[PDB]
Amino acid sequence: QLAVKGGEALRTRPWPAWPQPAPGVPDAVADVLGSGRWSISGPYRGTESYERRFARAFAAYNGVPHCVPAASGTASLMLALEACGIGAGDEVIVPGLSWVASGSTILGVNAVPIFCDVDPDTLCLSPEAVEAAITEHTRAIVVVHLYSALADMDALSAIAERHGLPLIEDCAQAHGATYRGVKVGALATAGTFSMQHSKVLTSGEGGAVITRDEDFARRVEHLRADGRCLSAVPPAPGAMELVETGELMGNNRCLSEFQAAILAEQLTILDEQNETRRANAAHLDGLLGELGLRPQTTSDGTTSRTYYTYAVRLPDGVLEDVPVTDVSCALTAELGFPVLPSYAPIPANRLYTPHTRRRYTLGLDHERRIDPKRFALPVCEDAARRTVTLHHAALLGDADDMGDIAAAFAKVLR
Amino acid sequence: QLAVKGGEALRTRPWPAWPQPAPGVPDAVADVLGSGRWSISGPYRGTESYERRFARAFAAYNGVPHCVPAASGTASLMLALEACGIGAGDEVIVPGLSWVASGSTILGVNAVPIFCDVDPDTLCLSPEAVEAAITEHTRAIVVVHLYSALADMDALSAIAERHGLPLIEDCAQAHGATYRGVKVGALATAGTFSMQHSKVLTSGEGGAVITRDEDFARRVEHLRADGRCLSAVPPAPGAMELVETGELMGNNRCLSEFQAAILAEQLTILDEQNETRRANAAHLDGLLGELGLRPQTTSDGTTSRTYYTYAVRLPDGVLEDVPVTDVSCALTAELGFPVLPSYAPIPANRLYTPHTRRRYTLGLDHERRIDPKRFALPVCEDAARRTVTLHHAALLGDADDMGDIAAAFAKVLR
Ligand SMILES: Cc1ncc(COP(=O)(O)O)c(CN[C@@H]2C[C@H](N)[C@@H](O)[C@H](O)[C@H]2O)c1O
Ligand SMILES: Cc1ncc(COP(=O)(O)O)c(CN[C@@H]2C[C@H](N)[C@@H](O)[C@H](O)[C@H]2O)c1O
């Protein structure tokens, strides 16, 4: 009966393509091609760079005054980290359940990630877990709005404010979502974004840092352009717009003109796309609830959700002896679309191997601190055993598609 | 009479635009747009990624079996360093005279850069300096083919081999140059490239690592894709092509498909554009020689030069107490094209401030070793005080263009 064991698939036809190119992209790219400036680090040519146009637009969209575009969400994390003053030996609190980059970025600026457990329904950083993990070395909190949920920002902001800690929102999986009507990434110290391929807003690769703090964005600017930042006023044509101010050392984490032009165009269809997903997901939550599955929920205070990924936990007492990879494999086969397990908890992820990397060999104390064996994360581990996920391309079709998703799940439950 | 001092400029006509888009780009990009895969970290869709196409193109272009593309010349360096096993506290020998990233990339893997003086005429890393600077802590040598010159690679390889030290060629400023017939970056352990805007091969932002060691490439691969590597053979369509091997922890420094596609197109005309620059530079060498200027020279054995930038030392006993910035500012106003001082030596570069980044505060002994105040680089200092430069866009025009350059020099020199 099951396709994985040679049965008939329920469905094999294609799902929606991703990404969906916005209509203005080829013109915007053509204009870049002819501009005589393909990165911000090239000389001023008399008009505004697409790096700036995008920054302006993305800032406006998130309802903040500052944005610094960047090469990747990995870069965005690291820039935001270092702009908070985070450095060698500082503890950064992070959720245990996220893509591996959530741990490796902290490592990459020589800080010590302090993996904290997550809420069992939303899978976002547990505030109770955060308070318990604060030490005298703690210097930042990173919160991920994971898959389709927002974290409990009222509680987290409360803990950050009390302790005098910056709170960074990693919105790689949440673009355009809103908590109490404020766009996610505009609620705390700084917001951080991926525009990698799979993300709801994408240029194949990219990122951004957003903030309400001018000095913060200025530090970020230095950190992404080798200690340079854009002049207040444009210079004459042929002169560098990035000035060697040298307030703070940096590296190059710049976003190309091509990618900036692409994101500006993709941004104009973002909300429409998120509406399509949102509606389909509302439909699915119902169908899957009827089967005893528990979809991921969102924190109280959330006013709109962005579905980067649909995550749903299997019903208690069903397939409890079958490894999730098998379950997810059988679903994949019925559906014609990947259905994958939840991320492993980071300290148990085979991709997280800091002792293999000589960059991090900083002597015994630091090696003890960053040893991932120190972290047990009951909720993350359970979620990893029990929760499967679908990428959001699956939410971009018809209401009928949701029926297929439910049919596959029902089939596999027997 | 000087334009800068109120007078009439010599030239106001515009100079060649840069970058020059290759004719296949729009179609290439449109192909990306509709492909359903905008990065390598997106699932496989039944055809080769542009990342693979460019990679294979650039490997073959350089005479070597392996190429791993990357997000920038900065990433490329850091990838190469970690793939040599460089980590915390290791010393890496580097030239004193180069863009600041040559220093900060080393710092970023927690290593201790050891700036060494250069050859007074080629401005490239001096063999004697390198030999003098070796210690039991040295774990690599990085050499830069600076501006338009190639280093003495036979001399450098010989020192590398004697000491059992890997030798990385930073070829950011030398795409397609050849030493004794062999493509630059194919001469030692690994070659790193920047495709930033201003470089001769560009996608606004981009880079590559090339090597003939398959294991080394595999390590680079892991290091750029968060501990993942492309499968030996493609998976089924819809499956991830990057596989979580667990062999080696990494970070995201992937290059987007859009950039990959652009670089594959721009590769097809690189040789022709290099020929143009070459002929203009030859002719300009003579003209500037007749004024007592000394053009940058290249190492014996160079079989062809890539001009990323035309560098030239001012004549001895002439303007010999006017700041270089002042001379370079005067030439610019005469030429309607930017002419700039050489790089400062990195330890004296205001962009180079380790003390400003708490990331590096690893302890007293480390902090002292990475203090740039420890260094003395007399040749770098002298060249920086007397050398001015023109980006290679100047070299893309006529012989009349070369005469304008000479005629600006002539005029400034009184
Ligand atoms: C919460 C969060 N924080 C930072 C990042 C890092 O963003 P990037 O450097 O753009 O990859 C991501 C990206 N995460 C994705 C996750 C995906 N499973 C993987 O295949 C992909 O390469 C990566 O872009 C994330 O989800
Ligand atoms: C020898 C060498 N090694 C590594 C790099 C680093 O490459 P990227 O990360 O691509 O900038 C460069 C680039 N250097 C350039 C130099 C230029 N003056 C500056 O305005 C520009 O932003 C930068 O890309 C280099 O020349």
Assess contact for B303 and B58: CB atoms under 8 A: no
Inter-axis angle of helices A50-62 and A257-267, to 10 degrees?
30
Asked if the Cβ–Cβ distance from B249 to A356 is below 8 Å, we say yes
CA B406–ligand 1 middle distance (angstroms): 52
Q: Which residues contact B363 (CB under 8 A, 6 or more apart)?
A: none
Interface size, chain A vs chain B, as Cβ–Cβ contacts under 8 Å: 228
Q: How far apart are the C-alpha atoms of A118 and A151, rounded to whole Å?
A: 9
Residues 6+ apart with CB under 8 A from B96: B115, B116, B117, B118, B345, B346, B347, B375, B377, B380
CA A102 / ligand 1 centre spacing (Å): 8
* CA A334/CA A404 separation, integer angstroms: 9
SS3 B318: coil
For B375, residues 6+ apart whose C-beta sits below 8 A from its C-beta are B96, B115, B345, B347
Asked if A110 and B108 come within 8 Å (Cβ–Cβ), the reply is no
What is the greatest pairwise CA distance in chain B?
71
Which residues in chain A are classed under CATH 3.40.640.10?
A: 1-267
CA distance linking residue B188 with residue A74, whole number of Å: 31
Q: What is the DSSP letter of B92?
A: E
Distance CA A129, CA A96 (A): 11
- The ligand 2 site (C-beta within 6 Å) comprises A 41, 252; B 72-74, 77, 98-99, 101-102, 144, 170, 172-173, 194, 196, 198, 207
Phi and psi dihedrals of B409, rounded to 5? -55, -55
Q: How far is CA B202 from CA A155, A230, B74, B350, in A?
A: 47, 22, 14, 27
Between strands A190-194 and A167-170, the pairing is parallel
Three-state DSSP at B83 gives helix
Q: Is residue B378 within 8 Å of residue B117, measured between CB atoms?
A: yes
- Three-state SS sequence of B149-218: CCCCHHHHHHHHHHHCCCEEEECCCCCCCEECCEECCCCCCEEEEECCCCCCCCCCCCEEEEECCHHHHH
User: Pairing relation of β-strands A91-95 and A138-144?
Assistant: parallel
Task: Name the minimum distance, in Å, from the CA of A194 to any CA of chain B.
Answer: 11
Is it true that the peptide bond before B19 is cis, omega within 30 degrees of 0?
Answer: yes
Chain A residue with CA closest to B21: the answer is A33
Asked if A216 and A190 touch (Cβ cutoff 8 Å), the reply is: yes
Strands A178-179 and A167-170: unpaired
DSSP-derived secondary structure letter, B65: S
Distance CA B206, CA B194 (A): 6
Distance of residue B33 Cα from the nearest chain A Cα, in angstroms: 6
Q: Are B230 and B44 in contact (CB under 8 A)?
A: no
How many Å lie between the centroid of ligand 1 and the Cα of residue B16?
40
User: B359, B370, B390: best mutation site toward chain A, by most A Cβ within 10 Å?
Assistant: B359
Query: How distant is the alpha carbon of residue B334 from its chain centre?
Result: 28
Q: What is the DSSP letter of B42?
A: S
Query: From CA B221, how far away is CA B215, in angstroms rounded?
Result: 10
Probe target for ligand 2 pocket from B194, B340, B346, with the most ligand atoms within 8 Å of CB = B194
* Closest C-alpha to A293, from A199, A152, A390: A390
Resolution for this PDB entry, in angstroms:
2.1
Long-range contact list for B63-66, CB < 8 A, 24+ apart?
Answer: B63/B182, B63/B183, B63/B186, B64/B183, B64/B185, B64/B186, B64/B191, B64/B210, B64/B211, B64/B212, B65/B212, B65/B214, B66/B210, B66/B211, B66/B212, B66/B213, B66/B214, B66/B216, B66/B217
In Å, what is the CA distance from B404 to each residue of A294, B211, B331, B398, B409? 74, 41, 11, 10, 9
Neighbours of B232 (CB within 10 A): 6
Q: In sequence order, what are the residues at sequence separation of 6 or more whose Cβ sits closer than 8 angstroms to the Cβ of residue A94?
A: A102, A103, A106, A113, A114, A115, A116, A125, A142, A144, A346
For residue B55, what are its two tokens? 């990679």
A158 and A141 in contact (C-beta within 8 Å)? no
Tell me, yes or no, if B104 comes closer than 8 A to chain A by beta carbon.
yes
Q: Which helix (H) or strand (E) holds B28?
A: helix B25-33
Q: Contact B36/A30, CB-based, under 8 Å?
A: no
Q: Is the separation of the CB atoms in A208 and A195 below 8 Å?
A: yes
Of B38, B74, B204, the CB nearest to A38: B204
d(CA B106, CA B102): 7
* Residue from B113, B189, B126, B185 nearest B155 by CA: B126
Q: How far does B244 lie from chain A, in Å, by closest CA? A: 7
Starting from the edge strand earliest in sequence, which strands make up the sheet with A178-179, in order?
A182-183, A178-179, A302-304
Provide the chain A residues 374-393 that lie in CB contact (below 8 A) with chain B.
none
Please identify among residues 129-188 of chain B the ones whose CB lies closer than 8 Å to any CB of chain A: none
The backbone torsions φ and ψ at residue A296, rounded to the nearest 5 degrees and listed phi first, read -45, 135
Q: From the centroid of its chain, how far is CA B17?
A: 21
CATH number given to A1-267: 3.40.640.10
Q: Would you call the peptide bond into A127 cis, given omega within 30 degrees of 0 as the criterion?
A: no
Ligand 1 atom with minimal separation from the B39 CA: 22
Cβ within 8 Å of residue B271, ≥6 positions away = B176
A34 touches chain B (CB under 8 A): yes
Q: Is the C-beta atom of A344 inside 6 A of ligand 1?
A: no
Report the gap between the CA of B24 and the closest CA in chain A (Å). 12
Write a three-state SS string for chain A.
CCHHHCCCCCCCCCCCCCCCCCCCHHHHHHHHHHCCCCECCCCCCCCCCHHHHHHHHHHHHHCCCEEEEECCHHHHHHHHHHHCCCCCCCEEEEECCCCCHHHHHHHHCCCEEEEECECCCCCCECHHHHHHHCCCCEEEEEEECCCCCCCCHHHHHHHHHHHCCCEEEECCCCCCCEECCEECCCCCCEEEEECCCCCCCCCCCCEEEEECCHHHHHHHHHHHECCCEECCCCCCCCCCCEECCCCCCCCECCCEHHHHHHHHHHHCCHHHHHHHHHHHHHHHHHHHHCCCCEECCCCCCEEECCCCEEEEECCCCCCCCCCHHHHHHHHHHHHCCCCEECCCCHHHCCCCCHHHCHHHCCCHHHHHHHCHHHCCCHHHHHHHHHEEEEEHHHHCCCHHHHHHHHHHHHHHHC
Tell me the chain A residues in contact with residue B197 when contact means C-beta distances shorter than 8 Å. 37-39, 41-42
Residue type, A97: L
Resolved by: X-ray
Chain B hits for A100, Cβ within 8 Å: 226-227
